[PDB]
Curated annotation (Swiss-Prot), chains A, B:
Its main location: cytoplasm. It comes from Homo sapiens. This is Retinol-binding protein 2. It is found in: Cytoplasm. Higher expression in adult small intestine and to a much lesser extent in fetal kidney. GO terms for molecular function: fatty acid binding; molecular carrier activity; retinal binding; retinoid binding; retinol binding. The keyword Cytoplasm applies. InterPro entries: Calycin, Fatty_acid-bd, ILBP, Lipocln_cytosolic_FA-bd_dom. The gene is RBP2.
Amino acid sequence: TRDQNGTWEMESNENFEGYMKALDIDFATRKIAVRLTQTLVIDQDGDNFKWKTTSTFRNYDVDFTVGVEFDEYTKSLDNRHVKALVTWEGDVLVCVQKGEKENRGWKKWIEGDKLYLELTCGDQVCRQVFKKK
Amino acid sequence: TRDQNGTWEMESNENFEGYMKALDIDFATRKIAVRLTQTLVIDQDGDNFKWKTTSTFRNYDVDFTVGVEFDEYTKSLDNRHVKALVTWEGDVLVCVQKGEKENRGWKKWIEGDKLYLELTCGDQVCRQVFKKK
Ligand SMILES: *C/C=C(C)/C=C/C=C(C)/C=C/C1=C(C)CCCC1(C)C
């Protein structure tokens, strides 16, 4: 069939490094690229094609209910099992991840027009700020 | 302000690598992940809270028509300008990318429920297979 419509997810990718050197891509960029997965969405109207390719490194979704404990496996992150519980502290959403790591969790809150996020592990805190699209 | 719904786009990241090292994420994954853009999607429905973090390297769109040559910019790819002609050899979508690289193009086709793609440049051939996610 010539119908190539659809969202496609890459399943196999060989000699991608050799092809990348043929285009003179620098070695640091080639290191990133070989670990990336690729999604390719084709929108086809006969001989008229439009397709988009996105290259991602690590996807990670989660779905929970506030105030209900849930088991969480952090695959593609650190690959640990934790017993997670998320509660509101006023306007701050607070998550504790009980497991091997001490002080493991995050805090997420709206301030003005922006989302702030603080990830914590042990004595390390990562602070992140997002703007809404 | 507990409504955190939205598509959120990172504007700053503090101590991300220290956080990952606290998690024992290997050095190579930390080096890649810190060079990437992170997009956070939040679907919030009452007490049900779903978030989905995507870490993307590069994104690329194109629309064209079989039989028509067209100026093309491999934006976010290798970032070259080419003259691309996409034709049908049987039920195979073949492309030749004219420009300052010898023997550049690709071929794409369907068999069953899988998309086969071959990227060519110089003497290098890259083969990829996609599953219809
Ligand atoms: C409220 C939002 C939260 C808790 C999201 C946090 C995001 C992370 C823990 C991100 C983790 C990483 C990636 C998805 C990419 C690769 C590196 C990781 C594992 C640190």
